[PDB]
Design a protein around this ligand. Structure first.
Ligand SMILES: CC(=O)N[C@H]1[C@H]([C@H](O)[C@H](O)CO)OC(C(=O)O)=C[C@@H]1O
Ligand SMILES: CC(=O)N[C@H]1[C@H]([C@H](O)[C@H](O)CO)OC(C(=O)O)=C[C@@H]1O
Ligand SMILES: CC(=O)N[C@H]1[C@H]([C@H](O)[C@H](O)CO)OC(C(=O)O)=C[C@@H]1O
Ligand SMILES: CC(=O)N[C@H]1[C@H]([C@H](O)[C@H](O)CO)OC(C(=O)O)=C[C@@H]1O
Ligand SMILES: [Ca+2]
Ligand SMILES: [Ca+2]
Ligand SMILES: [Ca+2]
Ligand SMILES: [Ca+2]
Lengths: 387, 387, 387, 387
């Protein structure tokens, strides 16, 4: 029966290693698929890894050029947790160069987007059959979250942007129930630009932390009520800035406008915004997608003077990172929702020229009420072995 | 319980990408099987891809010569949708160099044909056991559809041709129920030659669009009543000609004879013939198996002056195509049968001499009542990487 | 519930291709396992292929020397029908250099034998757990059938030989029920030597056709009653001789002694002995394991003057063959037991020196009451591609 | 429902080959994973193999350096019995460089440990979800058994050591029920150092035989009562010494102190201590991890003058061995628990310098009340083929 967001978040007093696939290490001598934009998403019975295939293996010739985002040869695949995404084990969800996928308790909705830049469309699959289709409304790269959505009693909202990336676009919040559109609504609130939303839910409410590609170095937040099918947006108030590139941390930050400093750029990220129990991930570097850290900044959302009270490094500054996103196993046993997250560890081009490809690995963590010690989690491939 | 063709076709206002496997791209660096004559066919619970193996991998030595149609080393395999047909994941349906396979609601019938040219025979498997066998009646390459049949309340008819390909042959329409022959009947109507029939059903009626190899550039149609176990044949009236090679589109076409122009040749194709809601696929080229397009030609079947009112390009003229065929997921949720189809994208010999093999990829589409934008769907392998 | 041999054999008016794996063709460019002594055996729900692994892939270095029968690195594996026996898909039944395996309706018994030549022992697995063990009684290569046994209402007898191969040995017929020994009895009748028994059952009776390695060129037959747990042996009377090497067909043959001519040698074979409905497989060559043919010799068992009344070539004389054996899908739908059989197609050493290995492929057939045309079924690998 | 240790051990009158994977042989030409610290562990329905991945294939470049125990790229994997641990077939249990895993009748608990040496922590997974976490208490390489634990009516105790390896450490016995900690207690008894405990249970009692790394050449034993959740420790009295390196067998040995001779070293081992029905495995060499033998030494535990009355060689002195451990299929049919065990056959570095890696194979045996003949079970790879 349909899942219902009835619990709240657990106390995050630290994070533990949940998954890790070592795909590029293993990809050096096995038939692993060139991927990017990963995520993790849970069924009632298993959790799996998800990414967009580039339709080729790493050591295969046709990997030269996989730095490009959109093509006819990409697809959404999922595979068993902590396994490299291989040719013989992956399952294709749908054919597309942007995606999101979530399970509603009853079965799973997966949405892939394809097309030329000016004539793209999305197909909503539900129970591995195509159900519903939607065309560009603004005719400029229709795109979605690049991580799992969240349902509540049958209703799974999904954020789409169609339009410019260096200026105003058109963002809709669609509400689906059984693959069918119930309703949609234009973006609202005070966020000036939305891209790559990273979402979760507890106590009958959904929270996405997205990406202002055009103006903000602080991240905008969409908060959705899946029952009333309404939403609102805002930015994160705290001055611990968390996009990338980003200027240095000020002592005061914006609640309702972009923080200026970098233009027309960023990276996918997430946050868990739960009062004093609020954490933020970011690249350590303000210039590259390098390093990854979590920071506990009580009332980040609303207290525009907040600064960290505790922290944890996931990946060292000398290691490469990339996208990151939220997920939770809503079907886990127990009293509260244990928060999880993933970082994409991109290897290859641009930052590593000697090779002609671009892939990534994954590392996944979930929280602990314990105060566990920390390690760091590099991709661990040796690029010279690919030369 | 046995499936029953009780719905009608949905409104096709465009086509969306359904599947795609990138096998030859991926085949460059994985253990993928050299195949041809693909198709797609649905079970109650999953849809899969189907093709005849050449009993060898692409990069394997024994791929030299896979331009030949019939041998002891071919087989019907199926695999998970949008996966390349690999050595470690394919399932063998039966041993044969021609085939068809369909599910009757209760379980699946798969028919492979083998033998020398003058002493071939077919074995009807049902529930993965062999049940019934049939010998050449005309002792000249017994052959079937090369795509899924259609049942209705237990009764799955299948079209076979035995005889010449450049002249008169003998075509029987067999009716099976549980793998057993109920009845068969010689071809009737006004079609002069039948090969490679592409079939579907709605509202208790079955429609195959086949191939006059010897005379016609317009395609003959067999229409079957699975309840009365009778059939009839005809040609498509419209002058938008759809075999290949074919002469140029006239302004008037034959309802009951072949349109002349090319002799002793053609390609497998399909159509959906549903009044004003009628669509036709064809190669864009009139000379090569190149490009693929869909065209909406209201009353193609019967109105011998009809010309397109809307269209969609699946594969550009500069890309290679090949066979194409119909399928529908009869077990999908909803009110009408959503029409689907596939194009085989042949690579290698003849048209690509530098290599000694012949394989293919797949792209599959299904309809949408939406008016979606279009992309094009090349195989996307780079043949020079195989040199 | 336990299976019961209640039907009789169907009319074999010809044989159809049932399975074929092309393993050595495919083995040239995939991770397939070096095997030998194959067979096919059925569960209630699927039929699979079975062979002894040499613990190495064909293209792998450790394939040099796989001409040897017994070692610590062999195992019984099974895999999905008509798939090459690959490293990633095979299942290990047990660890041993001789075997047999059968399903009793309830679950499956698999028996592997290992050890040094003078201290070997057998372990009876049942439901994938080890249950019962048996030591050499004559301390000279304890060995079993190399193909599936047959049960009836829970009771599966198995023939073992312990002793010399060029002279008298000690052969026991063990009766198992649920992996446990019910009883065993020394060989009886007039057969002078028993090896590699090939068995089937209908109408509550079991028939094995085995191998006199030391004296006979005509094949001895053990007939078992699984209910009374008694047996008897005999030779086949007909002069269509069917071991190999063998002298030429006489006009009269032995019912109760070996036919002389070749000493201390032979090959695994089978027959179906059902009155006028009696068929015999053999190598076409009297010198090599080459070619394979079926011959219909009414009352072969008992009429010592019988000669063929119809025939079918499975493999041409110019192609290599090897072991062969009986199986039937006792759980198939229908009124009679449809007879099946397999031929091992050995490649490599001895007869093909240029390579350092010895493997094989499979071809499987089952009967048809039809009179189907015939093809021939070579392994189809090109040994030069391995050089 | 929860499993309950209600039977006793069967009579071990010898040991039979149970499993064997030939991974390094097969690893020479397939995508097998570099592993070590294997074990075998049973579910209600299947038994599988288990080891820590080094996150790389043997023939892959990133195998250079896999002599190191702890890193970010290790994981616990399991795979189907007697299959090589391959990239496409393994399942990841959890991310860690030390482990144990057991099934409680209802579902399976798997515990992996990761971290830097001075800030490691353990996560207890249960039903493939993370449940409970535990941090270093002594801040010096927190480590567990490296083989399966044992439950009884829901309660699975596990031994952990945190501290020095060449001196006093801190060892806790934790009691889990459903992944949750019920209780834990410091080590007690007269054992001076505990590492790598190898455990089993019958008649409602649990017996681990562990490793005094710092002082003893005789092995300490922890005996646990899972109902009263108490334990005690002791050493094995017999003078048939069974760690490695070890001095030569004295004529009298310690019941309550270490036997002196080698310092700060050893290897994982096991014993079955059941009165006159007591067996001990060890390396044949007293200097290297070479050879493996079983010895029947009645009342080893308690009779400090005991010497072997019967024996069996598993691996010859000229072959390499390594860790070894106990398991039993508690869900097997029958009256008593049949004892099983495994030996890790390490290949590569240190003892084999020509290669830059370190992997292993497995051989598994279980007992027989029979008196079966013996063979020996080398890994069987040829290291020169890797040069
Ligand atoms: C639909 C698509 O191509 N999106 C791409 C997205 C886009 O370029 C940015 O969102 C500005 O609009 O970002 C990136 C990138 O690594 O930054 C890759 C994505 O796949
Ligand atoms: C049984 C068989 O070999 N049929 C072949 C079929 C045949 O040559 C044509 O139908 C004329 O009879 O067409 C082709 C081809 O690509 O055109 C390949 C098919 O496998
Ligand atoms: C146990 C064993 O090794 N048997 C072998 C068997 C034996 O050599 C013959 O039966 C004479 O005794 O025959 C052959 C062979 O291809 O002829 C290989 C078998 O595996
Ligand atoms: C946690 C860890 O690294 N343990 C290692 C363990 C340790 O070095 C010894 O127990 C002394 O403390 O032994 C060995 C070894 O082959 O001997 C490898 C283990 O993985
Ligand atoms: Ca930005
Ligand atoms: Ca034509
Ligand atoms: Ca003989
Ligand atoms: Ca020691």
């Amino acid at each position: 029966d349909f899942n219902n967001l009835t619990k709240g978040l657990c106390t995050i007093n630290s994070w533990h290693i949940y998954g890790k696939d070592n795909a590029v290490r293993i990809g050096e001598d096995s038939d692993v698929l060139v991927t990017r934009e990963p995520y993790v998403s849970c069924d009632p019975d298993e959790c799996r890894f998800y990414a967009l295939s580039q339709g080729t293996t790493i050591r295969g010739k046709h990997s030269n050029g996989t730095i490009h985002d959109r093509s006819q040869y990409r697809a959404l695949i999922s595979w068993p947790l902590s396994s490299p995404p291989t040719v013989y084990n992956s399952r294709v969800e749908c054919i597309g160069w942007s995606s999101t996928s979530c399970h509603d308790g009853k079965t799973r909705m997966s949405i892939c987007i394809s097309g030329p830049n000016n004539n793209a469309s999305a197909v909503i699959w539900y129970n591995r059959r195509p159900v519903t289709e939607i065309n560009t409304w603004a005719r400029n790269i229709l795109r979605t979250q690049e991580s799992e959505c969240v349902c509540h009693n049958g209703v799974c909202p999904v954020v789409f942007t169609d339009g410019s990336a260096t200026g105003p676009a058109e963002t809709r919040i669609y509400y689906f129930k059984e693959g069918k559109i119930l309703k949609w609504e234009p973006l609202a609130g005070t966020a000036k630009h939305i891209e790559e939303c990273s979402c979760y839910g507890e106590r009958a409410e959904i929270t996405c932390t997205c990406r202002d590609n055009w103006q903000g170095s602080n991240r905008p937040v969409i908060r959705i009520d899946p029952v009333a099918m309404t939403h609102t947006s805002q930015y994160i108030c705290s001055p611990v800035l968390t996009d990338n590139p980003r200027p240095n941390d000020p002592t005061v930050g914006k609640c309702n406008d972009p923080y200026p400093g970098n233009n027309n750029n960023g990276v996918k990220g997430f946050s868990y915004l739960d009062g004093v129990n609020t954490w933020l991930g970011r690249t350590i570097s303000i210039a590259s997608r390098s390093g990854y850290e979590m920071l506990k900044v009580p009332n980040a959302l609303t207290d525009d003077k907040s600064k960290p009270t505790q922290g944890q490094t996931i990946v060292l500054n000398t290691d490469w990172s990339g996208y990151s996103g939220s997920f939770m196993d809503y079907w886990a046993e127990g009293e509260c929702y244990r928060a999880c997250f993933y970082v994409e560890l991109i290897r290859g081009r641009p930052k590593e020229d000697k090779v002609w490809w671009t892939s990534n690995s994954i590392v996944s963590m979930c929280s602990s009420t314990e105060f566990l010690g920390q390690w760091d989690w590099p991709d661990g491939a040796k690029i010279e072995y690919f030369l």
